[PDB]
Amino acid sequence: MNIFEMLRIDEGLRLKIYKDTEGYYTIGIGHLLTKSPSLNAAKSELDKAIGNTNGDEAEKLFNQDVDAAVRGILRNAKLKPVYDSLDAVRRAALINMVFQMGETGVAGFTNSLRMLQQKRWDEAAVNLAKSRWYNQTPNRAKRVITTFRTGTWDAYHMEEKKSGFRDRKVMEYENRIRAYSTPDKIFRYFATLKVISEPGEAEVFMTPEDFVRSITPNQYIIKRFREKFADEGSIFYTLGECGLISFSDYIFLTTVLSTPQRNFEIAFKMFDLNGDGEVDMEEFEQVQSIIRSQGLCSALTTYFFGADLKGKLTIKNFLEFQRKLQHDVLKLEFERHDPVDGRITERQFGGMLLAYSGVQSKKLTAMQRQLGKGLTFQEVENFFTFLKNINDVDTALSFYHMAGASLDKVTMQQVARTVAKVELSDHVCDVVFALFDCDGNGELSNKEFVSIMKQRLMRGGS
Amino acid sequence: SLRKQRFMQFSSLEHEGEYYMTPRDFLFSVMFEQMERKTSVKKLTKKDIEDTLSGIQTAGCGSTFFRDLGDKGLISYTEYLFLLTILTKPHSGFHVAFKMLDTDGNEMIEKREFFKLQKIISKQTGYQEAIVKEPEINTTLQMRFFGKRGQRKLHYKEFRRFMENLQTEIQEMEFLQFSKGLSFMRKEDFAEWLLFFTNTENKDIYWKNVREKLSAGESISLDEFKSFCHFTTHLEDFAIAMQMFSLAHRPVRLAEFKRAVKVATGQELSNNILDTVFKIFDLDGDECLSHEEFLGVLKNRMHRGLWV
């Protein structure tokens, strides 16, 4: 652990040329070639201090940069007094800030900087956390500010943790918890909260982030005696209880998450008094129990059926419950990744598609070949809106196959337009095709792709 | 493949070692598994082609298109398969298939993409006498769809109107075959229809109920009958609503059956059909219908004995 490893975690290490946040060209560990606009000057500039390849151990660049950063710190009348007074580690944090914005920007934190010189660690950390700097990159800033406040690398040891065999073993054990244990054993395993109303007693609760962890393949921390565990417009507040998920609600949500809506319509219209689709409190219980085969909490039951518990649920209203709940769960599952400016890695989106197909690393093995550019939430949710119609989409794909048309990107994008009434962005197709062609031609293994997508869609199996 | 045995069982013409069907053939092969007097194959004359053009211009374009043609017509083996699929699974999303060979996105196809359109829908005796191989003969469907010269185009609207009319023609035609010519099916005649392709292990109870337990009532009219047929096509939404009654450990009585129908098809059945279906398939007499068995007979009748 040192500045190299620190600044390798905050600024990722990139082998090929790119542009940092502002316009300028950059390669390496945050190493700016030149501010010119031409890529060609960058390559030719890059080679003037490397000697003609746009490529790993040629990380002397980070080493010369730090030396220039230290040096620029030291001829600077505002950065130098502070740096000289800091120990080996806090110096690394300040070099880190200089890396991120250069000495002129750093040197503009004149009170925090002045605090670090008077060794007021907690003050400078409270004050620094208040700034745009932190607002723009809050995770980097918290590590830097910890490293300022405590004098230790503890902020980074936690993230330095990438060994695959010990960690896989717990992935594998946990996957079996989800797939084979009872709901009571699953709920108790992943729930993190406890609520103590002495009137009555202690009951375990789940935060939304716990709940999505329950159901997505691939431990008590807090007690509650009006907190908010869920985003401003979140289906979970209908459950009451601050956005927490009780056990009864865990049963209910996992049922309605992975049932196709046609089945709920047919279920509603069957047990409905008049078969039009409007089901009362009691008739609702047999519906959701019947659906389970193929004790709802008092907050929800009033939300649907009114506080007298005598209202009725419209298949139209409930169907929007389901549609809304499916959204927020997809949101939560999207953010369980690395949402850098609201885009996850290409390699991780691939991990959403195969999260329910078990030992399918073999497919992803050849997927990292091609790869860059993140994928927005809207890109993803559109694919997951595409999967809603997968039985209709599998029909179309087989036809285009027998008629001899190839199953390349235009076909898939056309099929998603025609039968799924949604537009699949270009990039998510490249990701989807790199994973499932499996042979290198831009042609999908349609029968195989439809098999894994049938398990993603319903979080089930085969 | 039983369909090649059906085609060959009823085909009445040979041309170039390739066998053909006439609309009269095609009808008989849809409602019968074998006929008492086999047909006479004759070598395809040159009058027939002259006649295949005549019948197109004088034949009902409605739900009598095949009865009017009759022996004036031609249906290749590839066409026959295509027509059978329309009648045994009318819901193979022909729309999306029609829309993939869509030309210029106007939802219509040209004669060239015809052979493909039959091929993608209908696919997934007489080895070489029956195969996908391309033809040089102008068949009745091709003349009607895209014109004699082939220069017309086929809009999906016309093609949906053609599948519906084809279904309607078999229903109208089977009505009279099984009603013995009278204008009202008997409850007993409806049963003979329903159980024509049923050869499973419980046919002794079904048929015993027909004879003993179901011989008096208000007779079944054509539109009462068609409405049952149009129900049998929607049976999978029915099958689901039935399963949910089992998982509810609920016996399916009449009032339940009436409900499963309105959800599956949006329409309700005559009282005399409901009564017939129950009297046949209420094996125990507990006024509770054996839906799993009633559902098996429906599949026999929908599949028309070709294993569809």
PDB file of C-alpha atoms in Angstrom, chain B residues 178-179 184-195 207 209-211 213-221 224 270-277 279-280:
ATOM      1  CA  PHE B 178     -72.524 -34.438 -38.102  1.00  0.00           C
ATOM      2  CA  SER B 179     -76.052 -33.051 -38.009  1.00  0.00           C
ATOM      3  CA  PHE B 184     -79.894 -28.350 -35.855  1.00  0.00           C
ATOM      4  CA  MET B 185     -77.286 -30.587 -34.292  1.00  0.00           C
ATOM      5  CA  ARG B 186     -78.696 -32.930 -31.692  1.00  0.00           C
ATOM      6  CA  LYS B 187     -77.005 -33.023 -28.335  1.00  0.00           C
ATOM      7  CA  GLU B 188     -76.116 -36.596 -29.350  1.00  0.00           C
ATOM      8  CA  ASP B 189     -74.666 -35.430 -32.678  1.00  0.00           C
ATOM      9  CA  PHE B 190     -72.566 -32.729 -31.043  1.00  0.00           C
ATOM     10  CA  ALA B 191     -71.056 -35.454 -28.886  1.00  0.00           C
ATOM     11  CA  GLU B 192     -70.200 -37.589 -31.900  1.00  0.00           C
ATOM     12  CA  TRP B 193     -68.456 -34.519 -33.322  1.00  0.00           C
ATOM     13  CA  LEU B 194     -66.569 -33.687 -30.150  1.00  0.00           C
ATOM     14  CA  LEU B 195     -65.396 -37.287 -29.700  1.00  0.00           C
ATOM     15  CA  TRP B 207     -69.694 -42.872 -24.994  1.00  0.00           C
ATOM     16  CA  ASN B 209     -72.744 -41.244 -21.019  1.00  0.00           C
ATOM     17  CA  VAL B 210     -73.711 -40.141 -24.512  1.00  0.00           C
ATOM     18  CA  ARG B 211     -76.056 -43.085 -24.909  1.00  0.00           C
ATOM     19  CA  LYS B 213     -77.235 -39.981 -19.760  1.00  0.00           C
ATOM     20  CA  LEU B 214     -77.706 -37.480 -22.620  1.00  0.00           C
ATOM     21  CA  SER B 215     -80.619 -38.006 -25.014  1.00  0.00           C
ATOM     22  CA  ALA B 216     -83.191 -35.194 -24.626  1.00  0.00           C
ATOM     23  CA  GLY B 217     -83.051 -31.408 -24.909  1.00  0.00           C
ATOM     24  CA  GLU B 218     -83.004 -28.199 -26.908  1.00  0.00           C
ATOM     25  CA  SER B 219     -80.942 -28.766 -30.041  1.00  0.00           C
ATOM     26  CA  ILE B 220     -77.685 -27.011 -30.898  1.00  0.00           C
ATOM     27  CA  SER B 221     -77.708 -24.395 -33.616  1.00  0.00           C
ATOM     28  CA  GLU B 224     -74.262 -22.043 -30.910  1.00  0.00           C
ATOM     29  CA  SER B 270     -75.278 -22.138 -24.962  1.00  0.00           C
ATOM     30  CA  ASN B 271     -77.021 -23.915 -22.147  1.00  0.00           C
ATOM     31  CA  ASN B 272     -77.330 -27.047 -24.232  1.00  0.00           C
ATOM     32  CA  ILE B 273     -73.616 -27.265 -24.920  1.00  0.00           C
ATOM     33  CA  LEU B 274     -72.751 -26.731 -21.251  1.00  0.00           C
ATOM     34  CA  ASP B 275     -75.215 -29.433 -20.313  1.00  0.00           C
ATOM     35  CA  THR B 276     -73.773 -31.847 -22.903  1.00  0.00           C
ATOM     36  CA  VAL B 277     -70.183 -31.296 -21.892  1.00  0.00           C
ATOM     37  CA  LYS B 279     -73.231 -34.969 -18.794  1.00  0.00           C
ATOM     38  CA  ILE B 280     -70.471 -36.628 -20.822  1.00  0.00           C
TER      39      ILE B 280
END
